[PDB]
C-alpha cells in the first residue's frame, strides 16, 4: 500500500531482523541434520594411493583413491571397500602412505541426507498482527537516512537465500544505475556492498562424470562415496563474459569516483589471505560446493582521464559452515556432469 506525504529514517546497519534471519537459517540448517547419519565408523585408517591417471610430477593429482576397513551390517564381519576423495579432505598421518580425514580430531561429520537438496526457495518473512513492515521505494536511496517514498506491506518479497562469500548470486537487481552502500566510507574495516543494474551471467560446471556407490555402514546406514570417474579427469571451472565484466567494472568505477573525487586511480587486486572460503569465492551449485579462484576478475586499473574469462575451482566434500566448534558436514557425490547458470548481481 503506497503511502503519501510520509518520511521515515531507515538504517540498514543497526537494523534488526537480519540477525533474526541469520539465526533462523543457522538453526534451521542444524535442524535438517538430526535425522541423517553420523559418520562415526568412518574416521578410520585410510590406505590411499594416487588416482589412476597420467601423473605429472610438477603438478599434483587432486584425487586420492583410498581403500579401507569398514564394518558391514553384521557386527562380526568387516569388509574392504574403496572410494575417491580430494586432497582438501584428507591428511597424511605419520615407506607406507596412510591417510586420515581432516575432521578426525574435532567432530564426527554428520552426513547430509541425499534425499534433501540445497537449492534456494523464496522465503517471505511476514510480520504478526499489531506489527507492520515498511519498504522504501525511493530509487536513489543509499540505505541510511530519511526515505521520502515508503509503502507498507504484509510480507516481504522473494529472498532466495544464497551461500556466497564474494560475488553474491541471484540477488535483487538495482533500478537504473550501480549503487554502492556502506555504513562509513572512510572506515576501511566496514565492507562496501556494490549492487549493479544489469546482471552478469556466470556459468559453472564440473565436467568429471562420477559414479555414486553405496557402502553399508550398518543396519539402515548408507555411506555414499565416489566410484569411477567416467572419462577425462578435468578441472571444474566457471565462465563469465569478458566484455560485460569489463563494462560492469567500468560502471562500478564510474560510481566509485563519486565518493573519492574524480582524479583518483582505482585498481582491483585479489584477496589478501586467510582461510579457503574468504579469499576465494564459494557457492553451492545444486548440492555441490565450489571454491573458485577470483584472481582473473579483480586484476585491473582505471585512470581518471567474444572471449570469456575462465576461472578454475576446487571442490571440497566436507565443510565447516559457519565455523562451529564441533559441527562438520559431509556432502554426498552427485551423478553426471554438473552445470549451473547464475547471475552475479553484486560485490563485497
Amino acid at each position, epitope marked *: 500500500i503506497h503511502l503519501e506525504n510520509v518520511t521515515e529514517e531507515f538504517n540498514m546497519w543497526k537494523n534488526n531482523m537480519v540477525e533474526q534471519m541469520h539465526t533462523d537459517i543457522i538453526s534451521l540448517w542444524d535442524q535438517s541434520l538430526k535425522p541423517c547419519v553420523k559418520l562415526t565408523p568412518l574416521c578410520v585408517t585410510l590406505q590411499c594411493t594416487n588416482v589412476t*591417471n597420467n601423473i605429472t610430477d610438477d603438478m599434483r593429482g587432486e584425487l586420492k583413491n583410498c581403500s579401507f576397513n569398514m564394518t558391514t551390517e553384521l557386527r562380526d564381519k568387516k569388509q574392504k571397500v574403496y572410494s575417491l576423495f580430494y586432497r582438501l579432505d584428507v591428511v597424511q598421518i605419520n615407506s607406507n602412505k596412510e591417510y586420515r580425514l581432516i575432521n578426525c580430531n574435532t567432530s564426527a561429520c554428520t552426513q547430509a541426507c541425499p534425499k534433501v537438496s540445497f537449492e534456494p526457495i523464496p522465503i517471505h518473512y511476514c510480520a504478526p498482527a499489531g506489527f507492520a513492515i515498511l519498504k522504501c521505494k525511493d530509487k536513489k536511496f543509499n540505505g541510511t537516512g530519511p526515505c521520502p517514498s515508503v509503502s507498507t506491506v504484509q510480507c516481504t518479497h522473494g529472498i532466495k537465500p544464497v551461500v556466497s562469500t564474494q560475488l553474491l548470486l541471484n540477488g535483487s537487481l538495482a533500478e537504473e544505475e550501480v549503487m554502492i552502500r556502506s555504513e562509513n566510507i572512510t572506515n576501511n574495516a566496514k565492507n562496501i556492498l556494490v549492487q549493479f543494474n544489469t546482471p552478469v551471467q556466470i556459468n559453472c560446471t564440473r565436467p568429471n562424470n562420477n559414479t555414486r556407490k553405496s557402502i553399508r555402514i550398518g543396519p539402515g546406514q548408507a555411506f555414499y562415496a565416489t566410484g569411477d570417474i*567416467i572419462g*577425462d*579427469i*578435468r578441472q571444474a571451472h566457471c565462465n563469465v563474459s569478458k566484455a560485460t565484466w569489463n563494462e560492469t567494472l567500468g560502471k562500478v568505477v564510474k560510481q566509485l569516483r563519486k565518493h573519492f573525487g574524480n582524479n583518483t586511480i582505482i585498481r582491483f587486486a585479489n584477496s589478501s589471505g586467510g582461510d579457503l572460503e574468504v579469499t576465494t569465492h564459494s557457492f553451492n551449485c545444486g548440492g555441490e560446493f565450489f571454491y573458485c579462484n577470483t584472481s582473473g576478475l579483480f586484476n585491473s586499473t582505471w585512470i581518471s582521464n567474444n572471449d570469456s574469462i*575462465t576461472l*578454475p575451482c576446487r571442490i571440497k566434500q566436507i565443510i565447516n559452515m559457519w565455523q562451529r566448534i564441533g559441527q562438520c558436514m559431509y556432502a554426498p557425490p552427485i551423478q553426471g556432469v554438473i552445470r549451473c547458470v547464475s547471475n552475479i548481481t553484486g560485490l563485497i
Partner: antibody
Amino acid sequence: QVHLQESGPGLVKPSETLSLTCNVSGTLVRDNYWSWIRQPLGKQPEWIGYVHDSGDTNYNPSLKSRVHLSLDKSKNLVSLRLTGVTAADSAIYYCATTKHGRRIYGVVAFKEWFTYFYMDVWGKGTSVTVSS
Amino acid sequence: TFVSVAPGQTARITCGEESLGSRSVIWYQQRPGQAPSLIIYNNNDRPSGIPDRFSGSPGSTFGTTATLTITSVEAGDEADYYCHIWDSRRPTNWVFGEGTTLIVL
C-alpha cells in the same frame, strides 16, 4: 619424396657399444622430427624414441641410459649410440620421421590436452644380431 | 589373432586395452618383409596415399576397445596390423599394441 637408409655392423659382440647411422634424401635433418623404433622377429615394434633440435629428445624410460640419439647437420644424417648389447637387442631397427599434433579434450589453458606422435614414412631396416 | 574374411566383405579388427578416457589411436600396417607404414594417424583421420573404407572408432567413447573397420578387403590388405593408442589417462606407450594379422582367401 623422402626415403631413408640405415647402416650397421650386423654382427655384435656382447658388452659392446652399438652404433647406427641413418641417411637422408630430399628433406634435411633440421626440417623435421626424427625417431628410432626397434622390432624383433615376429614381434610388435618397440618405439625407442625421438630426437630433434632444441631439447626435443625424450627417450624410452625402459632403457633411458644406454641409448643416445644424435643428429649430423654437417653431413645431414641421423645417428644412434647404444651401450651394453645383450641378447635381447637382436632386432631390426628403424629411423623414421614423425609429426606431432594436439589432441584437445578440455580447457586449453588448464593443460587439458596432449601431443601425440605418428611416423609417416619409414626407413628400411638393419638386421642387427648379437652373437659370439 | 587370426581373422579371415573372404574378399570383398567387411572386416573388424580390434586391438589394445579398453579405453579409460579420451584417446588418440594410431593404426599402422606391416607387409611381410617390408617396413611399417601408416594408415591411420588420428581416431578417424587418414593421410594421403591410403584410400578410404579404413574407418576408425572415435575416441570420444568411454570404456570401449579400439577397432579398425575395413570394407571391400583384398590381397593388398593382407598384412600385420598394429595399434598405438594415446589415452589421456594412461601414460605414454613406448611400445605398441598386440600384433593382429589379417589373411584373405
